[PDB]
Design a protein around this ligand. Structure first.
Ligand SMILES: *[C@@H]1O[C@H](CO)[C@@H](O[C@@H]2O[C@H](CO)[C@@H](O[C@@H]3O[C@H](CO[C@H]4O[C@H](CO)[C@@H](O)[C@H](O[C@H]5O[C@H](CO)[C@@H](O)[C@H](O)[C@@H]5O)[C@@H]4O)[C@@H](O)[C@H](O[C@H]4O[C@H](CO)[C@@H](O)[C@H](O)[C@@H]4O[C@H]4O[C@H](CO)[C@@H](O)[C@H](O)[C@@H]4O)[C@@H]3O)[C@H](O)[C@H]2NC(C)=O)[C@H](O)[C@H]1NC(C)=O
Ligand SMILES: COc1ccc(NC(=S)NCCCn2ccnc2)cc1OC
Ligand SMILES: [Zn+2]
Length: 307
């Protein structure tokens, strides 16, 4: 029922602990988490590629960025893409900042979703070529000096450009851009705090949002959620929130932006740590989300077009 796909909090908790370290681009911690993501994706049976590049940024000068991408069914026609950022924000006066909600927990949720749905993804899901699953760990989401158009979302700008560029020849020029084979980028951000609220930011992905609303109602009615707070609202968002999806949105990719609004109390303060996470909210999100991903992939037949 809701009971087909069970929790694995042992896995969740270890995965979170392994990500939850200071990880400004260029730091020892960032390299530790980078390597951890590669190992983890490989062990969950993904084809793993690193989009590594050098770029000059405020304060630091030249840094080496690396987006980490896992794919199952790489030669599929189209893809569900799920994403989070793995860098943490630089704060002169808070080198210990771990960004628990931003976005250690979102990143751990992605790996844990692949784990809990492993029995599907290991076999039946591989027996097809219509749809694949991409897990994208963006690097350099966070501004180095102050958030602006230029000082932000560095890894995503770079991955979006890479996926957008074509190869030579008739066959390529008549074929889609790689980036156009993403049916929707589902970006998770600011998840971990008590009683988060997710509202729909884009009309074209509103039916996907409605599915989350529905899965939540179904699991609640079956007694499978903790507490009585509604996490997925059937409401449009207040204003838009700038994030890693922007460079993708700009190349016409549809976006489901699962960022909590209001932002967690602790956002961009030293208190965005494990002590301030709310595990029942994490578990509730995980249950809704793993079922959403499963259903999307299981119900997929023809290309999903939301452009
Ligand atoms: C992934 O990581 C997360 C984060 O680290 C882990 O989350 C933690 O999970 C643990 C264990 O499940 C949680 O601790 C447990 O909390 C229970 C609820 O406590 C609160 O509510 C109850 C009301 O229901 C209050 O009574 C409590 O107040 C008292 O305790 C607090 C906490 O120290 C004190 O500050 C207070 O002043 C009170 O004294 C809380 O408000 C709680 O039931 C449970 O208690 C068990 O263990 C204690 C000793 O630690 C025993 O005294 C007690 O007997 C309980 O033992 C169980 O088993 C024995 C049999 O041996 C039976 O006698 C009992 O009936 C009972 O079943 C424990 O404290 C913790 O809160 C939670 N942390 C966070 C931040 O969410 C996940 O577990 C982890 N997941 C995995 C898979 O590893
Ligand atoms: C504190 O509440 C808010 C603060 C700012 C904004 N607006 C924008 S456009 N934010 C860009 C966020 C980029 N990011 C995400 C994670 N780390 C950085 C909205 C907020 O609440 C609705
Ligand atoms: Zn942030």
């Amino acid at each position: 029922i809701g009971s087909q796909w069970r929790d694995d909090e042992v896995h969740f908790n270890r995965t979170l602990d392994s990500i939850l370290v200071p990880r400004v681009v260029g730091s020892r911690g960032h390299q530790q988490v980078r390597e951890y993501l590669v190992q983890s994706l490989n062990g969950l049976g993904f084809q793993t590629e690193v989009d590594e590049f050098k770029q000059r940024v405020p304060v630091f000068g030249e840094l080496t960025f690396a987006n980490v991408v896992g794919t199952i069914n790489p030669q599929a026609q189209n893809f569900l893409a799920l994403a989070a950022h793995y860098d943490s924000k630089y704060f002169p006066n808070d080198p210990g900042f771990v960004g628990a909600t931003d976005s250690a927990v979102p990143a751990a949720i992605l790996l844990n979703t692949a784990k809990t749905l492993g029995a599907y993804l290991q076999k039946e899901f591989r027996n097809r070529s219509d749809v694949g699953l991409m897990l994208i760990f963006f690097d350099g989401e966070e501004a180095f000096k102050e958030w602006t158009d230029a000082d932000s979302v560095y890894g995503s700008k770079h991955l979006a450009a890479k996926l957008a560029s074509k190869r030579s020849g008739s066959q390529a020029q008549l074929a889609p851009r790689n980036i156009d084979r993403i049916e929707v980028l589902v970006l998770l951000d600011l998840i971990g705090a008590r009683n988060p609220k997710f509202s729909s930011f884009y009309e074209n992905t509103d039916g996907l949002h409605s599915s989350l609303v529905q899965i939540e109602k179904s699991l609640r009615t079956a007694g499978q959620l903790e507490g009585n707070n509604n996490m997925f609202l059937s409401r449009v968002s207040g204003g838009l929130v700038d994030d890693d999806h922007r460079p993708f949105l700009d190349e016409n990719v549809p976006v489901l932006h699962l960022v909590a609004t209001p932002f967690p109390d602790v956002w961009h303060t030293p208190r965005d740590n494990a002590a301030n996470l709310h595990w029942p909210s994490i578990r509730n999100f995980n249950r809704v989300f793993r079922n959403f991903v499963y259903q999307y992939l299981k119900r997929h037949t023809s290309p999903v077009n939301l452009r």
